[PDB]
Design an enzyme around this catalytic site. Structure first.
Site, PDB file in Angstrom:
ATOM      1  N   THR A 161       7.964  10.650  33.664  1.00 17.06           N
ATOM      2  CA  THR A 161       9.278  11.304  33.851  1.00 17.06           C
ATOM      3  C   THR A 161      10.010  11.332  32.516  1.00 17.06           C
ATOM      4  O   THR A 161      10.588  12.381  32.162  1.00 17.06           O
ATOM      5  CB  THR A 161      10.105  10.533  34.882  1.00 17.06           C
ATOM      6  OG1 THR A 161       9.959   9.162  34.513  1.00 17.06           O
ATOM      7  CG2 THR A 161       9.653  10.772  36.303  1.00 17.06           C
ATOM      8  N   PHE A 168      18.082  11.362  39.281  1.00 13.85           N
ATOM      9  CA  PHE A 168      17.677   9.941  39.427  1.00 13.85           C
ATOM     10  C   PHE A 168      17.755   9.498  40.888  1.00 13.85           C
ATOM     11  O   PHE A 168      17.804   8.300  41.147  1.00 13.85           O
ATOM     12  CB  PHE A 168      18.498   9.056  38.492  1.00 13.85           C
ATOM     13  CG  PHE A 168      18.227   9.326  37.031  1.00 13.85           C
ATOM     14  CD1 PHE A 168      17.051   8.919  36.428  1.00 13.85           C
ATOM     15  CD2 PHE A 168      19.161   9.989  36.251  1.00 13.85           C
ATOM     16  CE1 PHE A 168      16.819   9.153  35.079  1.00 13.85           C
ATOM     17  CE2 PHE A 168      18.913  10.251  34.911  1.00 13.85           C
ATOM     18  CZ  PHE A 168      17.754   9.830  34.323  1.00 13.85           C
ATOM     19  N   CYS A 184      17.051   5.609  40.899  1.00 18.17           N
ATOM     20  CA  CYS A 184      16.216   5.108  39.800  1.00 18.17           C
ATOM     21  C   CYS A 184      16.819   3.847  39.177  1.00 18.17           C
ATOM     22  O   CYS A 184      17.925   3.898  38.608  1.00 18.17           O
ATOM     23  CB  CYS A 184      16.082   6.193  38.752  1.00 18.17           C
ATOM     24  SG  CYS A 184      15.012   5.706  37.389  1.00 18.17           S
TER      25      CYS A 184
END
Ligand code: HEM
Ligand SMILES: CC(C)c1ccc2c(c1)CC[C@H]1[C@](C)(C(=O)N[C@@H](Cc3c[nH]c4ccccc34)C(=O)O)CCC[C@]21C
Length: 455
Positions: A268, A393, A400
């Site tokens: 990512t 996120f 995240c």
């Protein structure tokens, strides 16, 4: 008024399943969303999900009193090697809340002050690589960004040097991790997975899991055998106690957390940097503004933590790359109870939703007509953004944990790249987004002309 949900084209008894028999399924679902709008049903033999694309509906999906994280089939296949690490665990599993409580303080903005020196170590290796290219040479952007992000999480995570800038071929752990991730993703569109034809795939998958476990279990055992206290996540996990249960993580769960971080830091984050540089070379006025900020702020041979925090326009460039091509492009939810979505769509307890993040980020009701333009200045006034409009996120307690780490690393590296080099899109690169676990601009290449500023 209760409304019937649109549905894309069907294939008789296979329903919608063949639509994801494609090497670009996220881009395929974005085109379906363009045609069908903010919600559509997707049926396959034995499953249904609903793909959401509007801020109006995703703001409700993000209500944690009504919806919790679901493990997509993608996450369930990755769980065969990421186990009950944070990313592949259900919220209700004991090891999720224990690891969340133990690791949150290690991933805070203030924790980034402690990782900064290690991040600079790898960022300087990237700058030195590019300073040492000959006149005739170019940069393979996703390849070098992945060298950087993988090495950064290995060093900050576990004090382990993958030494990716010393290699053409990945470290053997990384060849096994990438092949295990490719098998996980390949299994999503594999009919008859217990056909003996796949015996070779299964043998290879188990060998690759053994390679990953052997190295990570050895690193944990070695660290316990030395008593060494380092600036890394492994020290925090060996020492940490969950305030709620009062328990530490066991060594098996620590291994799953390390594998989880290495997946995240390889995929990512390097895609964010790759897309950011793509958009900068395609938008020279934006590149010039970002380069002017880097030159004004980064007045020392290597950046300080505080200087990275003052790269405000570079942070806006990164947010605008995350808006257009978020590199973890979907997440899954389930309804905790029967509920009505958006006053229109009744759901039963257990019903699943998929959030299609790149399509959310193209909602013209939020961003205006210019949604396809790369305009970092959209992020000048973030209080103006309605709730849950920008979700690269993820959401809530299952968002995240790496967000501050990813953004610090990316801001530092992009700031140094813009301070040290002028860039040329020498091939007039045509964007081709390859879909794996993540998204990347496949074959993106540039030339970098040194500004001849010493480190
Ligand atoms: C640009 C870089 C990154 C993006 C776009 C990203 C995106 C996301 C998203 C969307 C989720 C939620 C997934 C879901 O709901 O199923 C997530 C979870 C997570 N990410 Fe990241 N991530 C990034 C970098 C990182 C890094 C660098 C780390 C660790 C070093 C990391 C570790 C995690 C973990 C452990 C979770 C699970 C958190 C939990 O549920 O408790 N990510 N990430
Ligand atoms: C591991 C993480 C980083 C990850 C990576 C890719 C995807 C995800 C998450 C979650 C979403 C997922 C996509 C878009 C998705 O919607 N999948 C759904 C639906 C689905 C597709 N084929 C299936 C076969 C059996 C059962 C379910 C499915 C799903 O996975 O349940 C498929 C491509 C990979 C992608 C982007």
């Amino acid at each position: 008024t209760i409304k019937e949900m649109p549905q894309p084209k069907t294939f008789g008894e296979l329903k919608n399943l063949p639509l994801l028999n494609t090497d670009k399924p996220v881009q395929a679902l974005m085109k379906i969303a363009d045609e069908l709008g903010e919600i559509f049903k997707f049926e396959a033999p034995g499953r249904v999900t609903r793909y959401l694309s509007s801020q109006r509906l995703i703001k409700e999906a993000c209500d944690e009193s009504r919806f919790d994280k679901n493990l997509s089939q993608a996450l369930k296949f990755v769980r065969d090697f990421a186990g009950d690490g944070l990313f592949t665990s259900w919220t209700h599993e004991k090891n999720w809340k224990k690891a969340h409580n133990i690791l949150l303080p290690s991933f805070s903005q203030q924790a980034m002050k402690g990782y900064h020196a290690m991040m600079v170590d790898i960022a300087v290796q990237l700058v030195q690589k590019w300073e040492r290219l000959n006149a005739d040479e170019h940069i393979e952007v996703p390849e070098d960004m992945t060298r950087l992000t993988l090495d950064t999480i290995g060093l900050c995570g576990f004090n382990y040097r993958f030494n990716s800038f010393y290699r053409d071929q990945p470290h053997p752990f990384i060849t096994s991790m990438v092949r295990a991730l490719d098998e996980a993703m390949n299994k999503l569109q594999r009919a008859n997975p217990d056909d003996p034809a796949y015996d070779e795939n299964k043998r290879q998958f188990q060998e690759d899991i053994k390679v990953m476990n052997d190295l990570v279990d050895k690193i944990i055992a070695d660290r316990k055998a030395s008593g060494e206290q380092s600036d890394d996540l492994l020290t925090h996990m060996l020492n940490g106690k969950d305030p709620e249960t009062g328990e530490p993580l066991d060594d098996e769960n620590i291994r799953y957390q390390i594998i989880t971080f290495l997946i995240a830091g390889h995929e990512t984050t390097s895609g964010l940097l790759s897309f950011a540089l793509y958009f900068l070379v395609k938008n020279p006025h934006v590149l010039q503004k970002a380069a002017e900020e880097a030159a004004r702020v980064l007045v020392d041979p290597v950046p300080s933590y505080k200087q990275v925090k003052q790269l405000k326009y570079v942070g806006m460039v990164l947010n605008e790359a995350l808006r257009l091509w978020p590199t973890a492009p979907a997440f899954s939810l389930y309804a905790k109870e029967d509920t009505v979505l958006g006053g229109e769509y009744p759901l039963e307890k257990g019903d699943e939703l998929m959030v299609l993040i790149p399509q959310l980020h193209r909602d013209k009701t939020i961003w205006g007509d210019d949604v396809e333009e790369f305009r970092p200045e959209r992020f000048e006034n973030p209080s103006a953004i309605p709730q849950h409009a920008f979700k690269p996120f993820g959401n809530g307690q299952r968002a995240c944990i790496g967000q501050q780490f990813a953004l610090h690393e990316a801001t530092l590296v992009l700031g140094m790249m813009l301070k040290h080099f002028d860039f040329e899109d020498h091939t007039n690169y045509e964007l081709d987004i390859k879909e794996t676990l993540t998204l990347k601009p496949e074959g993106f290449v540039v030339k970098a002309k040194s500004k001849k500023i010493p480190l």
